[PDB]
Amino acid sequence: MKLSDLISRWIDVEPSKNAQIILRDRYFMKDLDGNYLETKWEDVARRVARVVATAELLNPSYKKNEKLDRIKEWEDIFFRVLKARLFIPNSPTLFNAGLGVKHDLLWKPIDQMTLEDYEEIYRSRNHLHMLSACFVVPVGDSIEEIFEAVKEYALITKVGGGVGSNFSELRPKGSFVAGTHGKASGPVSFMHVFNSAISVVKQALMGILNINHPDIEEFIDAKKEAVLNFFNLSVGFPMDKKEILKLYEEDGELELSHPRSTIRKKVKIRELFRKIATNAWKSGDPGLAFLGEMNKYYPLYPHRKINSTNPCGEIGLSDYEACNLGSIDVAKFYNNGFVDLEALQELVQIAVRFLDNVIDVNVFPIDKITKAVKESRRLGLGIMGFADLLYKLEIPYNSQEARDFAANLMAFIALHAHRTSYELGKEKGNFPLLEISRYRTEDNFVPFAMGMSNYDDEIREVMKMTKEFRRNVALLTIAPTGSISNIADTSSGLEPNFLLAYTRFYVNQVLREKLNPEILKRIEKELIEKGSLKDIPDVPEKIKKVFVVALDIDPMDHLLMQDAFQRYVDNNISKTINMPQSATVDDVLNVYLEALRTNVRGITVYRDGSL
Amino acid sequence: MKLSDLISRWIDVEPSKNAQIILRDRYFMKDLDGNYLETKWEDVARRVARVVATAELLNPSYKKNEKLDRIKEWEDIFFRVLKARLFIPNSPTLFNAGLGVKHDLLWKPIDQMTLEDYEEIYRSRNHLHMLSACFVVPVGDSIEEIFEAVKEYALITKVGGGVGSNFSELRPKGSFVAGTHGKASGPVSFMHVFNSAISVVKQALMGILNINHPDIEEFIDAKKENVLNFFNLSVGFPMDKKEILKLYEEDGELELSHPRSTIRKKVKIRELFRKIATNAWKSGDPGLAFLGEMNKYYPLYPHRKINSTNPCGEIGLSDYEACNLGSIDVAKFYNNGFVDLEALQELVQIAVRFLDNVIDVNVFPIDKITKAVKESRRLGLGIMGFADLLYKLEIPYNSQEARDFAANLMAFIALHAHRTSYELGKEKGNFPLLEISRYRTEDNFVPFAMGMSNYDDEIREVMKMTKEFRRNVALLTIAPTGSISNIADTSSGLEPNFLLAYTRFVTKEDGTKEPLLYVNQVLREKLNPEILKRIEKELIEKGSLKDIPDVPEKIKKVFVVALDIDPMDHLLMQDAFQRYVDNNISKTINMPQSATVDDVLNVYLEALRTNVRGITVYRDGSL
Ligand SMILES: Nc1nc2c(ncn2[C@H]2C[C@H](O)[C@@H](COP(=O)(O)OP(=O)(O)OP(=O)(O)O)O2)c(=O)[nH]1
Ligand SMILES: Nc1nc2c(ncn2[C@H]2C[C@H](O)[C@@H](COP(=O)(O)OP(=O)(O)OP(=O)(O)O)O2)c(=O)[nH]1
Ligand SMILES: Nc1nc2c(ncn2[C@H]2C[C@H](O)[C@@H](COP(=O)(O)OP(=O)(O)OP(=O)(O)O)O2)c(=O)[nH]1
Ligand SMILES: Nc1nc2c(ncn2[C@H]2C[C@H](O)[C@@H](COP(=O)(O)OP(=O)(O)OP(=O)(O)O)O2)c(=O)[nH]1
Ligand SMILES: [Mg+2]
Ligand SMILES: [Mg+2]
């Protein structure tokens, strides 16, 4: 089906009562007196479309002559997919597009727009016009750099960004400070100053410490039981995953050291791993960030380096880099037993241009960030609706069938997104750092593992073409989509449905269609208690096996789904490895070891009932 | 007596074992290994004398063939008064002088020193070579400025400075923030971020909020145990003391308002005072800062404006200003029933040059601070050992006699301090803002109240003369001297002795522990050693001589401690010194456990009528 025809299928499907509540609550603009300037999703779609279309003002391919026509065309296409909720950008784009702009320019009808109208939108974007979810700032080993980072956290947090740092540069607790006296207090103590700052600004962060840091044990125990409540904590593994797996298998020792300290110590890697696992078992923190694996696929490494991710894991970013995200609802592409790939390719091309255009109309609080974004132009296109699509396709999330499907789907998306980036580099100009990247200096560089799709060879040649032309250093991610999937009335990112029937502060729509009412109306009671179909007798085996929820799916099937998607994603993936309440610490270690052998770039575990 | 003769009486008296522990503990310099580079007070005095004498390189009145002789002469005099412990600068001068300099230059015999040796010292002072105790920075009403200030606090604290701010620019909690629909959190929420920052960096501060800020009540209670545990807190009074007294006397109302909020409130000034008094009665916070009174006597006002003090309250500073302090031990100037004014004058002269010289060798971590200090050259010359001096002269602290003597002594110090500033302004150049100060644009400007001394008219004359030459915007203070009075083995600041005897413990390898009885040295000298041994027991038990049978009445009357002296007599002493001090004074108004909140109010009311620039109260037994 053509995308315009898919759009006509979805454009007039109204957001649910639940979606409308969230939108009124957080998304619709209000005036200086709390009066609504927007009252429907279509108002949001119009403002967002128009502001992002404005980027086409800077398109060197257009003559001043056609610009108005071309702009209005892009506004029109952006508006239609958005109103149809086939693609939605990350929250900050929805909150903050048009901040600074005359109200009378933001919702005016497109046929009435003039070239001067777009120019004035472009020029009136203010300091709050911040449209990206993801940030990483360094924290250098000096009081000066530490507290400059604290200020950067406050400023990014204030404008609506989530920020992450690797704190490893900070010399360990007790290290000599060539001051008068006395001693360095170490990374963890300074992370409390970050927490306290953000707790007041927000009156959601990421903190990583590398496995070979001498204060790693204190770090692992840092949210145990003063927390640290605004931090997600991950242990960083800057070295090769293979190397750590070997060391664990051999019961080796890790040397803890720091370049600006005499503090040195040896620890058994197994002991340290177990300590990580025990705490994750108890409370879900800390996670694992496979930084080396991220740098393995980083086009700008080693002259730039990924040291941290954003709070949710899904983008590894170099220092001062930010990334804006957006997600395609794949559940809307179900068509009579198949994914309508015709319409999908069209949308992926549109989604990539929109995300790239967001960069040009984005305003950041810190010039170093403006600069890092301009040079790399990293994007984060992902998907949501995945689990709901599997229900429509009558495929069990816990099956090799689902994972082979997932991999081909992501490969197809990756192929058309990178092809779009080639196209946009031709039209608009390459990302400034193309010349020094592995797309250019290397042969056969591919920013992900592949190995589970028929599309590989096609991907490999598109990657070779991007030696010459390429708008973006990387393009793909899979985010949590915690709010935008609610707006889209669909499942979140790549996660299975957590529950089929609930009451968020609500019976799945696909289940409501496939399940005979009466079988439904009976069971909807004990579905809500119990939280699964599994042990409800007199529901058909076929419904049971397809309509699985997160805790129907064992930890290994969670991890293998993440691997299958990660093979064709150039940034990272947000995925929780749900574990049953009866899972032991050994079960958790086994997840870590399997994770080390797969292509996953990080791990988050959550044991049911643990918190 | 000539100062040289006084120096020779003291130069070979080594610090008490008590002092030496303090020195080893934190003053003596160590190498990267943890090894001692200094092991005697004499070593510290060489280093410091040498480093501060280096500033004479820059003296535009020395011809090149003069310079090396002149510098060695200043190093020698500096060394002697330090070694003798007649003058000691604030701790950061003693911690940090010479940091960055090659160890082979800091202690070498002076008769091996060359001009190039001094030039190398000047060049190699590093970024940690911070010699001043006292700082103020502004905290403006934006996230950017608030966190820029958190960063300055961390940097200033790291290098050994104590910093304060007025947080009144921050719009009250619940205020409108433009272009968003979220509200401002308020000054007290941000002060938590500053307390967190500094609790890690130090793993006190001064915070002031003005009495008319709408969050003033929250602030008054901010260290109420239900904590800003690294802050001293004071309430700011930027209006005239007179205005506030009148309002209180009328049972009037104050309007709380902010220029960037629509939040207004009317509160009875008496109810606000009582809230303050009750909290201070419970816990010692908050104190009162009479900022308007400080601005009354600030020579740069209103071009520049004092909005805060340092943590101990004794310097009022404008935005980004810092001050270096030091103190003369005046108990050492006792001579046959009189204060030796001839030797004291000479030492004021030396001490003011030292302190002004510290500015030249000081390194600050922030641009705007270097600038503010160069432009003003504020100093804080003070005294310690004043209580022990009264003991020697047999004057009771809690008496008009003591207060009249304090005023005259402070007046004499002020006169010769400001005179030296005059002489130094001709010799080295005036402070840059002389031209726009009240020393220039006015007639009869005096930066303190006076009214309690025979020296008043000569003081007027010198202030008139400094319309022409003046090296420093202000010169004097009285500081707590919590460490350096320990070092000099003398009483702290202008304060009375807290106790005359107590047990201190000397840590030993094989024992331990151990009991070591200290008795005030002047008490030891005056009281019968036979009497002493009898009473010693009850004195440590009771904390005073007052109710001990059969100690002579005159001894009980002279040898008073802090708690023998009633709150008004503490306050009037502060008033006597403040009259002849251009900066402020550190003074705790001690109160008996049996004082009430009404008694605390009465101290505040009397404070409003005297010339004091702020108030701190501490009720015995409260914390
Ligand atoms: N908690 C605490 N940590 C400090 C202090 N001074 C330094 N540190 C920690 C902060 C940094 O992680 C590390 C280095 O800090 P700085 O570079 O500011 O110290 P500095 O440059 O004086 O000495 P350096 O030449 O770098 O060893 O030491 C301090 O006063 N308090
Ligand atoms: N799941 C969920 N998220 C919420 C809720 N309220 C606020 N949020 C937050 C979660 C995210 O930090 C923020 C933005 O949501 P999005 O769906 O745009 O972003 P996503 O969850 O993909 O996270 P990210 O883009 O990595 O920051 O909204 C809620 O009630 N449920
Ligand atoms: N806790 C908290 N306070 C804030 C936040 N934003 C602003 N404030 C407080 C900090 C300052 O006291 C005051 C003003 O903040 P800024 O100058 O950074 O805000 P902005 O320039 O955006 O708006 P303005 O024109 O000053 O109203 O409001 C925030 O997001 N969280
Ligand atoms: N470690 C330690 N520090 C102390 C003690 N008593 C006071 N201090 C701190 C607070 C002072 O700001 C700092 C330096 O001692 P000083 O005698 O030079 O300063 P002072 O008490 O006059 O306070 P100020 O110069 O206003 O900061 O020493 C103590 O018993 N132990
Ligand atoms: Mg450093
Ligand atoms: Mg502002």
Side-chain angles (χ1 to χ4, degrees):
Chain A
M1 176 183 290
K2 286 217 155 155
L3 209 220
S4 65
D5 303 321
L6 187 64
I7 290 165
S8 309
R9 171 141 78 207
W10 288 104
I11 197 145
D12 291 305
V13 186
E14 205 189 299
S16 83
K17 283 190 170 182
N18 183 65
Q20 285 164 357
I21 287 166
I22 300 163
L23 290 170
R24 277 162 206 147
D25 178 45
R26 305 200 257 139
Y27 291 92
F28 294 158
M29 288 196 164
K30 299 180 197 206
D31 65 20
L32 274 85
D33 330 74
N35 270 337
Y36 289 102
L37 292 183
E38 294 182 312
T39 60
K40 53 205 19 295
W41 176 241
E42 103 166 70
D43 300 336
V44 189
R46 193 89 255 163
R47 157 172 65 83
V48 170
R50 171 158 295 162
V51 177
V52 185
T54 301
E56 295 294 334
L57 231 29
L58 303 162
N59 188 338
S61 285
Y62 302 152
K63 319 130 185 175
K64 223 85 202 166
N65 182 261
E66 64 185 311
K67 279 188 164 159
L68 181 60
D69 288 321
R70 295 283 197 153
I71 294 173
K72 301 171 59 187
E73 273 151 29
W74 281 120
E75 177 177 342
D76 168 50
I77 189 57
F78 292 164
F79 167 77
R80 282 183 291 113
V81 316
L82 293 170
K83 182 173 183 283
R85 300 177 298 149
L86 297 177
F87 163 80
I88 306 186
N90 59 191
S91 293
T93 298
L94 305 180
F95 293 143
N96 303 324
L99 282 183
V101 181
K102 260 43 231 291
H103 300 337
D104 69 26
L105 291 183
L106 280 178
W107 303 278
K108 95 185 274 200
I110 168 158
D111 47 282
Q112 268 165 340
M113 284 292 289
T114 60
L115 187 49
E116 292 307 319
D117 286 347
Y118 285 111
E119 273 160 6
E120 207 31 70
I121 288 166
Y122 187 75
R123 261 154 9 212
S124 54
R125 299 141 49 234
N126 72 19
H127 64 111
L128 302 191
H129 200 276
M130 205 282 307
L131 311 176
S132 305
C134 302
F135 290 81
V136 160
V137 298
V139 182
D141 191 40
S142 64
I143 297 292
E144 161 71 24
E145 286 165 304
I146 291 163
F147 281 87
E148 183 60 38
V150 173
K151 173 165 103 172
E152 290 169 346
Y153 270 54
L155 295 175
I156 290 162
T157 287
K158 180 181 176 230
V159 297
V163 62
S165 292
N166 193 318
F167 285 91
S168 296
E169 279 314 278
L170 306 192
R171 71 189 64 166
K173 174 190 266 201
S175 296
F176 184 75
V177 173
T180 261
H181 307 284
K183 298 185 158 192
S185 60
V188 167
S189 68
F190 293 105
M191 289 178 72
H192 295 285
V193 182
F194 292 80
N195 198 257
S196 159
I198 291 308
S199 69
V200 171
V201 175
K202 295 183 87 204
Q203 185 185 117
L205 299 174
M206 165 71 59
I208 296 178
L209 195 67
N210 287 350
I211 188 60
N212 39 19
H213 201 279
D215 291 342
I216 188 55
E217 295 173 275
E218 185 191 19
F219 177 91
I220 293 170
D221 280 339
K223 282 225 292 186
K224 199 187 174 178
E225 295 183 58
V227 307
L228 288 198
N229 62 128
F230 284 79
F231 272 100
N232 289 333
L233 294 193
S234 282
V235 179
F237 296 85
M239 73 282 301
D240 192 305
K241 286 167 67 178
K242 262 156 206 140
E243 168 166 327
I244 278 314
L245 178 54
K246 198 190 176 184
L247 190 78
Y248 183 109
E249 282 178 336
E250 307 188 340
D251 189 34
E253 290 214 67
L254 181 66
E255 189 74 287
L256 311 189
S257 70
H258 193 275
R260 286 164 308 272
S261 180
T262 66
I263 306 202
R264 271 230 153 195
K265 192 202 187 176
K266 288 220 162 136
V267 184
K268 284 301 214 187
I269 199 66
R270 293 195 187 167
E271 266 11 273
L272 206 37
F273 267 72
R274 179 160 227 104
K275 194 180 148 66
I276 301 170
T278 295
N279 277 4
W281 181 89
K282 286 179 174 153
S283 75
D285 280 74
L288 316 179
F290 298 134
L291 298 174
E293 186 67 6
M294 296 178 201
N295 279 307
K296 189 178 185 197
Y297 294 108
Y298 183 28
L300 288 166
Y301 180 84
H303 205 232
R304 270 163 187 80
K305 176 169 178 179
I306 303 167
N307 288 301
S308 192
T309 66
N310 69 301
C312 286
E314 74 274 33
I315 317 282
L317 287 157
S318 59
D319 279 353
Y320 300 113
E321 215 190 337
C323 186
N324 64 294
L325 316 197
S327 290
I328 291 163
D329 181 1
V330 293
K332 293 194 184 90
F333 288 74
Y334 171 73
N335 193 217
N336 304 138
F338 305 85
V339 171
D340 180 346
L341 296 186
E342 164 186 16
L344 193 48
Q345 164 170 355
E346 297 185 77
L347 180 57
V348 168
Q349 301 168 173
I350 292 150
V352 170
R353 191 179 197 103
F354 173 112
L355 285 182
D356 186 75
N357 284 15
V358 167
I359 295 174
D360 301 316
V361 295
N362 213 336
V363 190
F364 305 103
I366 299 156
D367 299 359
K368 267 170 180 154
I369 302 180
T370 299
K371 180 181 203 218
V373 176
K374 276 198 198 138
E375 299 189 325
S376 289
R377 308 196 70 88
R378 196 188 290 269
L379 307 177
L381 177 62
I383 68 164
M384 51 186 167
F386 182 65
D388 276 357
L389 180 56
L390 295 187
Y391 288 166
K392 294 170 174 188
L393 282 164
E394 308 207 343
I395 305 176
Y397 191 106
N398 51 346
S399 60
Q400 193 68 47
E401 174 186 22
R403 301 189 279 281
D404 289 357
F405 179 70
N408 279 311
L409 175 63
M410 205 48 245
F412 171 93
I413 296 162
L415 178 62
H416 297 286
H418 285 260
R419 220 170 246 152
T420 313
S421 201
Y422 177 91
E423 287 160 4
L424 262 359
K426 277 228 184 112
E427 182 171 346
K428 290 183 163 188
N430 293 334
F431 72 100
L433 304 178
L434 213 207
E435 287 91 332
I436 57 168
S437 71
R438 293 154 72 187
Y439 293 117
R440 169 75 50 91
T441 58
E442 275 201 33
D443 282 334
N444 319 309
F445 171 75
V446 181
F448 37 68
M450 315 196 269
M452 274 181 76
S453 177
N454 59 100
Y455 297 102
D456 294 5
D457 284 332
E458 278 154 83
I459 296 161
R460 233 175 258 109
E461 52 191 80
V462 76
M463 299 297 309
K464 276 208 271 300
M465 294 162 57
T466 68
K467 189 169 273 193
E468 219 201 314
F469 290 116
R470 173 177 274 284
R471 183 66 170 164
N472 304 106
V473 67
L475 287 118
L476 308 156
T477 190
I478 297 316
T481 72
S483 301
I484 67 174
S485 58
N486 291 137
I487 292 171
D489 287 317
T490 195
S491 53
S492 308
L494 53 35
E495 300 279 7
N497 285 286
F498 191 79
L499 300 157
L500 286 162
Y502 50 107
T503 50
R504 221 164 158 155
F505 294 90
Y506 212 153
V507 181
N508 185 274
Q509 199 194 102
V510 187
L511 178 67
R512 196 193 287 296
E513 299 159 349
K514 288 287 168 52
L515 191 66
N516 298 330
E518 288 188 327
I519 288 181
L520 197 159
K521 237 233 156 176
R522 183 198 320 159
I523 74 158
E524 72 190 344
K525 297 196 162 198
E526 105 195 70
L527 211 218
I528 294 205
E529 144 227 317
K530 276 186 180 59
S532 177
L533 298 163
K534 189 198 162 40
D535 284 323
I536 313 178
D538 301 303
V539 10
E541 164 268 297
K542 237 51 142 45
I543 305 281
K544 271 180 188 206
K545 273 136 195 63
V546 162
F547 285 86
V548 290
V549 291
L551 294 159
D552 296 337
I553 298 144
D554 71 24
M556 287 302 182
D557 287 342
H558 279 283
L559 177 53
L560 293 173
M561 186 62 78
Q562 185 188 169
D563 167 71
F565 274 94
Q566 185 65 79
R567 282 164 178 278
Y568 298 96
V569 168
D570 49 6
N571 292 295
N572 305 310
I573 288 168
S574 135
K575 172 85 190 87
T576 289
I577 311 303
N578 297 105
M579 306 190 306
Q581 198 189 176
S582 56
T584 59
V585 162
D586 284 295
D587 289 339
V588 181
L589 292 165
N590 284 344
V591 173
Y592 293 174
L593 296 169
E594 184 60 8
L596 282 170
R597 283 194 289 267
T598 59
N599 294 277
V600 301
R601 277 129 94 162
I603 279 298
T604 287
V605 308
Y606 186 68
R607 190 178 59 98
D608 181 51
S610 62
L611 285 194
Chain B
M1 170 181 254
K2 289 173 198 224
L3 221 208
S4 58
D5 300 337
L6 185 53
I7 284 170
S8 70
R9 280 170 39 207
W10 283 102
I11 196 150
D12 298 344
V13 177
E14 290 188 338
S16 68
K17 310 234 197 125
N18 190 63
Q20 288 172 344
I21 298 159
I22 285 159
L23 292 172
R24 295 212 163 280
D25 183 45
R26 63 172 175 287
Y27 292 83
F28 295 160
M29 209 168 256
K30 294 169 176 186
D31 63 17
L32 329 132
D33 320 333
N35 275 263
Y36 280 98
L37 301 160
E38 291 178 324
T39 55
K40 273 187 150 150
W41 173 248
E42 201 186 358
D43 301 329
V44 177
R46 197 88 254 173
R47 165 167 55 88
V48 171
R50 185 157 287 158
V51 172
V52 171
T54 297
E56 294 304 324
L57 263 349
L58 311 172
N59 185 351
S61 281
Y62 293 154
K63 292 294 218 193
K64 69 125 98 321
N65 48 13
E66 214 175 344
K67 245 152 205 177
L68 183 63
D69 287 334
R70 293 295 87 75
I71 293 168
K72 289 177 178 212
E73 283 171 6
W74 290 116
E75 165 174 349
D76 178 55
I77 192 47
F78 296 165
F79 168 78
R80 277 186 290 144
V81 312
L82 298 169
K83 195 185 162 172
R85 293 177 300 145
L86 286 168
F87 167 83
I88 302 175
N90 56 197
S91 291
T93 301
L94 309 165
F95 296 140
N96 297 330
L99 286 183
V101 173
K102 260 59 170 75
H103 305 335
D104 67 11
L105 289 179
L106 292 179
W107 301 281
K108 68 146 137 182
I110 185 172
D111 65 37
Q112 301 175 17
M113 285 293 301
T114 76
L115 191 66
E116 232 169 67
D117 284 349
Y118 286 104
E119 277 156 8
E120 191 180 323
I121 290 170
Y122 188 70
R123 278 192 338 261
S124 59
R125 289 142 53 238
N126 75 15
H127 61 114
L128 305 179
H129 200 266
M130 205 286 301
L131 312 181
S132 303
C134 306
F135 290 79
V136 169
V137 300
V139 184
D141 196 24
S142 65
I143 292 297
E144 157 76 32
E145 295 170 286
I146 275 145
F147 283 88
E148 189 60 15
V150 171
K151 177 197 212 194
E152 297 163 351
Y153 268 46
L155 292 170
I156 291 162
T157 298
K158 163 186 179 222
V159 292
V163 54
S165 305
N166 198 315
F167 284 83
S168 297
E169 298 290 350
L170 307 191
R171 71 193 62 166
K173 191 200 262 176
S175 294
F176 181 77
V177 181
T180 108
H181 298 239
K183 305 301 186 206
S185 46
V188 170
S189 70
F190 294 99
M191 303 182 64
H192 286 87
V193 179
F194 291 83
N195 198 83
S196 288
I198 300 326
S199 81
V200 170
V201 179
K202 293 199 106 85
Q203 179 184 321
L205 303 170
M206 174 54 67
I208 294 184
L209 199 80
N210 285 348
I211 182 76
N212 34 35
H213 189 286
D215 289 337
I216 185 59
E217 288 162 296
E218 196 185 11
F219 179 86
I220 289 159
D221 286 0
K223 303 235 287 187
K224 215 190 175 164
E225 212 193 35
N226 282 330
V227 62
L228 293 165
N229 67 120
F230 277 76
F231 271 99
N232 297 319
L233 261 18
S234 283
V235 178
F237 292 92
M239 69 289 301
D240 197 296
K241 291 170 66 173
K242 289 207 171 58
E243 279 184 48
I244 279 312
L245 183 54
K246 179 161 207 175
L247 230 220
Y248 192 101
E249 277 165 347
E250 288 165 347
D251 203 18
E253 305 194 344
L254 190 64
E255 169 107 300
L256 313 189
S257 75
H258 191 270
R260 296 169 283 280
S261 183
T262 48
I263 286 175
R264 278 200 294 175
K265 196 196 187 168
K266 267 174 206 61
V267 298
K268 278 235 189 313
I269 194 60
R270 295 205 185 157
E271 299 191 4
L272 237 31
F273 264 82
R274 185 173 273 273
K275 187 174 178 91
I276 305 176
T278 301
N279 274 338
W281 178 99
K282 287 179 195 190
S283 82
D285 283 273
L288 313 185
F290 306 131
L291 298 167
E293 191 74 5
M294 295 173 215
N295 289 301
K296 193 157 146 188
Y297 299 98
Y298 185 21
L300 288 163
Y301 182 79
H303 305 26
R304 272 164 189 67
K305 181 181 177 197
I306 289 168
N307 284 314
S308 184
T309 69
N310 72 299
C312 293
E314 80 272 22
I315 325 298
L317 297 153
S318 53
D319 288 356
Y320 301 107
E321 207 180 348
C323 194
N324 59 301
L325 313 189
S327 299
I328 289 159
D329 180 5
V330 293
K332 283 180 179 97
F333 290 78
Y334 170 73
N335 193 216
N336 302 147
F338 299 78
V339 69
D340 189 340
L341 293 184
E342 154 182 49
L344 187 54
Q345 175 189 323
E346 287 180 76
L347 185 62
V348 163
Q349 279 161 184
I350 295 165
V352 167
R353 199 180 181 111
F354 180 103
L355 284 179
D356 182 74
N357 273 19
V358 170
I359 288 169
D360 295 332
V361 291
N362 210 339
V363 185
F364 297 109
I366 296 139
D367 70 320
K368 278 163 154 178
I369 300 174
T370 303
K371 181 160 206 286
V373 172
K374 277 157 161 189
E375 274 172 6
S376 280
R377 308 186 72 82
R378 184 183 309 261
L379 319 181
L381 179 56
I383 65 161
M384 47 187 173
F386 174 76
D388 287 343
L389 180 49
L390 295 183
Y391 282 5
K392 289 190 184 179
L393 303 164
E394 320 251 18
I395 292 158
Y397 196 96
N398 58 342
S399 72
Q400 194 66 47
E401 183 183 13
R403 300 195 286 270
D404 294 348
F405 174 79
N408 279 319
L409 170 73
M410 199 61 245
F412 176 84
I413 299 175
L415 171 59
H416 293 283
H418 278 260
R419 213 170 244 169
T420 306
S421 193
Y422 174 86
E423 292 149 45
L424 262 23
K426 52 84 184 151
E427 178 178 9
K428 309 196 176 199
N430 286 342
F431 75 103
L433 306 178
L434 205 197
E435 283 76 357
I436 72 166
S437 70
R438 294 156 74 191
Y439 295 114
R440 182 61 63 77
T441 64
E442 278 194 40
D443 312 284
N444 316 303
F445 167 81
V446 182
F448 35 70
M450 307 188 294
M452 271 186 75
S453 190
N454 59 95
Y455 296 107
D456 290 10
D457 275 345
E458 291 153 75
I459 288 160
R460 290 191 271 258
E461 156 62 352
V462 74
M463 294 301 157
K464 262 198 264 296
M465 283 168 50
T466 67
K467 188 188 287 226
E468 75 164 357
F469 296 105
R470 175 168 278 281
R471 177 67 165 173
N472 313 101
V473 72
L475 294 101
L476 311 156
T477 194
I478 319 289
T481 69
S483 284
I484 65 162
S485 63
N486 279 350
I487 293 173
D489 287 311
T490 194
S491 60
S492 296
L494 48 37
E495 300 283 2
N497 282 292
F498 195 75
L499 295 169
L500 295 159
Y502 45 97
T503 319
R504 78 221 343 192
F505 292 162
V506 159
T507 183
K508 297 177 58 215
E509 205 222 76
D510 26 37
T512 318
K513 164 77 257 95
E514 212 192 7
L516 220 97
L517 160 93
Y518 163 75
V519 177
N520 181 280
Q521 181 149 138
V522 193
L523 191 53
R524 273 187 306 238
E525 125 173 318
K526 285 265 168 67
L527 192 74
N528 218 91
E530 201 186 45
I531 297 173
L532 219 160
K533 204 135 220 145
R534 181 181 64 84
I535 78 171
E536 276 178 15
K537 334 215 156 219
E538 209 194 355
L539 180 68
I540 305 187
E541 163 217 330
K542 291 198 141 181
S544 172
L545 298 172
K546 57 163 171 171
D547 310 323
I548 303 182
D550 258 292
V551 20
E553 214 52 29
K554 267 174 203 143
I555 292 269
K556 279 170 181 221
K557 284 192 164 304
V558 170
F559 291 86
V560 290
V561 296
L563 295 164
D564 301 323
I565 298 159
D566 74 31
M568 294 304 173
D569 286 338
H570 282 282
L571 177 66
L572 290 184
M573 188 68 70
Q574 184 188 160
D575 170 85
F577 287 89
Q578 186 60 81
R579 285 169 179 264
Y580 294 96
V581 162
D582 47 21
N583 292 305
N584 310 317
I585 292 193
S586 160
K587 180 77 180 87
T588 294
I589 303 303
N590 298 97
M591 293 185 83
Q593 198 157 187
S594 66
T596 57
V597 172
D598 290 345
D599 294 329
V600 175
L601 285 169
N602 285 333
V603 172
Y604 296 168
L605 297 166
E606 184 49 31
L608 291 166
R609 306 186 222 269
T610 62
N611 297 280
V612 294
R613 295 187 202 166
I615 291 299
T616 293
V617 306
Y618 182 64
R619 185 179 52 107
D620 180 57
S622 70
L623 280 176

